[PDB]
Swiss-Prot record:
The chain holds residues 2 to 326 of 643 of the full protein. Disulfide bonds: none annotated. Keywords: Apoptosis, ATP-binding, Calcium, Cell cycle, Cell membrane, Kinase, Lipid-binding, Membrane, Nucleotide-binding, Phosphoprotein, Serine/threonine-protein kinase, Transferase. The KA1 domain mediates binding to phospholipids and targeting to membranes. The modification Phosphothreonine is found at T55. The keyword Transmembrane does not apply. It comes from Mus musculus (Mouse). One of its GO terms (cellular component) is cytoplasm. GO terms for biological process: apoptotic process; cell population proliferation; hemopoiesis; intrinsic apoptotic signaling pathway in response to oxidative stress; neural precursor cell proliferation; positive regulation of apoptotic process; protein autophosphorylation. ATP binds at I16, G17, T18, G19, G20, F21, A22, K23, V24, K39. Monomer. Interacts with ZNF622 and PPP1R8. This is Maternal embryonic leucine zipper kinase. It comes from the Eukaryota.
């Protein structure tokens, strides 16, 4: 059905979630045996939103990072688009916050530093996410955060998280992270309403309830981030070494990628070459074209698998 080219490389399991655009399916890469998440999108249903998909894809191909969900493979058929992705079995941050009611300040800070690491890195590559919220943050197996959903990425998004300058890009991501921070620590939104007009007025007004359990430090950070005028809003630079962010850390936030593809792994390349019937030298030329085809998927999946084993050795 144009699924059958995909079934060459993967065997599909159950649907794990949906979004406006896409169905997400658990899958297994047959050759490596690695679990993956596959994002299936119908081009005909996408309709006039198709360019956002091509923005999403080009962005994910340019980002490689510990807190950004890795893309392994992009397949296009007549009707569908498939994105093969890192499987994050922990689910959304949103569900976690709800299971705890709210997070302790100390725990908020662990989460927040990983968000900041990912977000500062996204910016260092010239993007703005524009849809930061805890539905778009996932825990992988190690309980580490991965940022997802780059469809509104720019080189928009939910209203409750949207910056006032945007409802009428670096500064805007700071506003949304400000909203995130409120939710982690409080368990509800600073601006909420059943009426969008009422909600809009609350956002522009910029006044929210400050609960008793918050620290003065965190309160101040909130007001620095939740400045309505982007000019007065705190910059990313200063967020990265902010005193609250560093409380009880000798390490300010390391946003740089710990996972560049500096050079090719011998074990992985060797393994690839045997299956592919080519020498390691030939295979090294092939991999470096980086087409996010099946060769790319298999190399990256093999690398992901090696890294996992090496952590228990
Ligand atoms: C539920 C689960 O356990 C799980 C496990 N592993 C994953 C691995 C990658 C992606 C993924 C999803 C989207 Cl929509 C992306 O754009 C990207 Cl880049 C990755 N999602 C999941 C994943 N996501 C589900 C499916 C629905 C999606 C929901 N809304 C868009 C809010 C997010 C939650």
């Amino acid at each position: 059905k144009d699924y059958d080219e995909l079934l060459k490389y993967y065997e599909l399991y159950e649907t794990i979630g949906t979004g406006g655009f896409a169905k997400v399916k658990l899958a297994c890469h047959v050759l490596t045996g690695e679990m993956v998440a596959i994002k299936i999108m119908d081009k005909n249903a996408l309709g006039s939103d198709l360019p956002r998909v091509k923005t999403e894809i080009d962005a994910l191909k340019s980002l490689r990072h510990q807190h950004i969900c890795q893309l392994y493979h992009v397949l296009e058929t007549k009707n569908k688009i498939f994105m093969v992705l890192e499987y994050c079995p922990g689910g959304e941050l949103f569900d976690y916050i709800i299971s705890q009611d709210r997070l302790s300040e100390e725990e908020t800070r662990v989460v927040f530093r990983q968000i900041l690491s990912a977000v500062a890195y996204v910016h260092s590559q010239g993007y703005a996410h524009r849809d930061l919220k805890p539905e778009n943050l996932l825990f992988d197996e190690n309980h580490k955060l991965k940022l997802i959903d780059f469809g509104l990425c720019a080189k928009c998004g939910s209203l409750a998280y949207a910056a006032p300058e945007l409802i009428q890009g670096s500064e805007a991501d700071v506003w949304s992270m400000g909203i995130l921070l409120y939710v982690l620590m409080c368990g509800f939104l600073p601006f909420d309403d059943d009426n969008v007009m009422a909600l809009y007025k609350k956002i522009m007004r910029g006044k929210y309830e400050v609960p008793k359990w918050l620290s003065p430090s965190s309160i101040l950070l909130l007001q620095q981030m939740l400045q309505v005028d982007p000019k007065k809003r705190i910059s990313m630079r200063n967020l990265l070494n902010h005193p609250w962010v560093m409380q009880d850390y000798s390490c300010p936030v390391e946003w740089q990628s710990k996972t560049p593809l500096t050079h090719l792994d011998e074990d992985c390349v060797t393994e690839l070459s045997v299956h592919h019937r080519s020498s390691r030298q030939t295979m090294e030329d092939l991999i470096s074209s980086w087409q996010y085809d099946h060769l790319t998927a298999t190399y990256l999946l093999l690398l992901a698998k090696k890294a996992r084993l090496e952590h228990h050795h």
